[PDB]
Design a protein around this ligand. Sequence first.
Ligand code: JLH
Ligand SMILES: OC[C@H]1O[C@H](O[C@H]2[C@H](O)[C@@H](O)[C@@H](O)O[C@@H]2CO)[C@H](O)[C@@H](O)[C@@H]1O
Length: 513
Amino acid sequence: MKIEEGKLVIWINGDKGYNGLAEVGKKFEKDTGIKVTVEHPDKLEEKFPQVAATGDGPDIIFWAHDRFGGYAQSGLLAEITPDKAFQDKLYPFTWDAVRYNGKLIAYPIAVEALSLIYNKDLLPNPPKTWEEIPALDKELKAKGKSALMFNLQEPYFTWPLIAADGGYAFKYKYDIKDVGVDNAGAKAGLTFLVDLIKNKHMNADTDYSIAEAAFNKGETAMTINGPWAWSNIDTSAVNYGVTVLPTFKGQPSKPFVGVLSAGINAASPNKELAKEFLENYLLTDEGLEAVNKDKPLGAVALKSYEEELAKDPRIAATMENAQKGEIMPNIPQMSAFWYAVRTAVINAASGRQTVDEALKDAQTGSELYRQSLEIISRYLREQATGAADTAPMSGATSRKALETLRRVGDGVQRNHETAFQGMLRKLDIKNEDDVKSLSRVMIHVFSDGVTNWGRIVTLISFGAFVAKHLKTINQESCIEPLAESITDVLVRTKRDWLVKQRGWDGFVEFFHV
Ligand SMILES: CCc1sc2ncnc(O[C@H](Cc3ccccc3)C(=O)O)c2c1-c1ccc(OCCN2CCN(C)CC2)c(Cl)c1C
Ligand SMILES: OC[C@H]1O[C@H](O[C@H]2[C@H](O)[C@@H](O)[C@@H](O)O[C@@H]2CO)[C@H](O)[C@@H](O)[C@@H]1O
């Protein structure tokens, strides 16, 4: 087993107070003898699922809660079971953020939302609207300054504007069928952003470091950032305020709210130690103070300490932005959603694609898993049972993709029956455990090779062949898991290619009669 027993390794992002966290570790080590190592790897949110899948990684991972449902769905996190008395020390809505499929999958630490950060010496009155920023920038450029710089590389920072006039990720329970990435609100916000770039009020290449340095040196009047940033601003002696984000088309900017949370690796042989550290050392007044003093956490989950911090006007502004925003969903398709929108924003800002092209692709990318599952699940089930699903189907594409797959998929099963049968007789499929062991095979087979529509039809057509078998041996319950497996394999390893082909519209086009 890869993770070492008798110590704690912790991963946390490099913008958080990891020196403070290490101080809490020192205190844990003092009491118990157990060494605590804090690390801050680049791209840790993409690295964790890769390493944890193989049984490796940190004992504890810290991230906003949006990534944790994906982790939990993949079996990477231990269920946490604090008692009533500990649960009652934290705000109920923070626990809701870390609930997935009825189980608690992490400990909530703190509530974070973006705010408008402004230099009070340059801009005694910050703008109320995004619409007035171009004029303010022109005024400021005549004095050697700029109005606003913020990270354009990460969609978390552009999202408040995109969402203002109507963009949304997943509607309201969260409806995974209803995605608002390329609606009219979304387009208007992204367009306003690209116009700021086109008119030289911002630069498409601005990232976290460039924006932070410009603000902290007094060269730009505003930035958009989170509570973590306030420490470095204090160091710089900029006279800053923290306030409400500007409105767009009369409506508030809607930041996605995150709950910084701590999850325990399912492979860790140190779960009792991790729970003891998190509950009795970190999530205490002193523990959170030590972290907070290094980089501010925002509104902490711990009611006792939150009451002390609540008086701070920067925190009050954070909560006001948070109330106008929306708690991020934690569903497993969040990762895909962020990856598509990141790409959309970068390509739109750079002029690689137009706003319409960019957000079209993002909408495709964000809907891809669900749309694929629907198609694949329907085809496997109808093949296995001999009757189609009567529920309505998005709808036109799905219906036509299913019609196409019925032609080409039946061809493949028919002409390749003997290899199919042979490969299904080799494997001793008879229950959910074997199907479990199929993705593995499919992952090494499907990936290793060319990516084209024929190889995709092959995977799905073999899927159907298996489903038929499953039905005859009264293992019908295993079909939907089979469809989820095939779908995951397809959309994880071929996402970029699929988005390039216009998704399933492409599939319909390619095999068109
Ligand atoms: C779960 C297995 C999967 S998943 C999957 N995904 C994409 N493509 C696949 O196959 C195509 C090539 C191919 C086209 C047409 C029919 C078979 C395969 C490819 O990899 O490009 C597969 C196979 C696969 C891979 C190999 C096979 O056959 C392997 C060779 N023989 C060995 C002897 N035995 C009797 C039959 C299988 C068989 Cl029977 C399947 C379903
Ligand atoms: O930009 C997409 C990104 O947004 C959020 O990440 C935030 C994070 O929540 C904050 O703690 C801070 O570190 O900045 C990050 C943005 O760079 C999501 O939590 C994340 O999953 C998503 O990829």
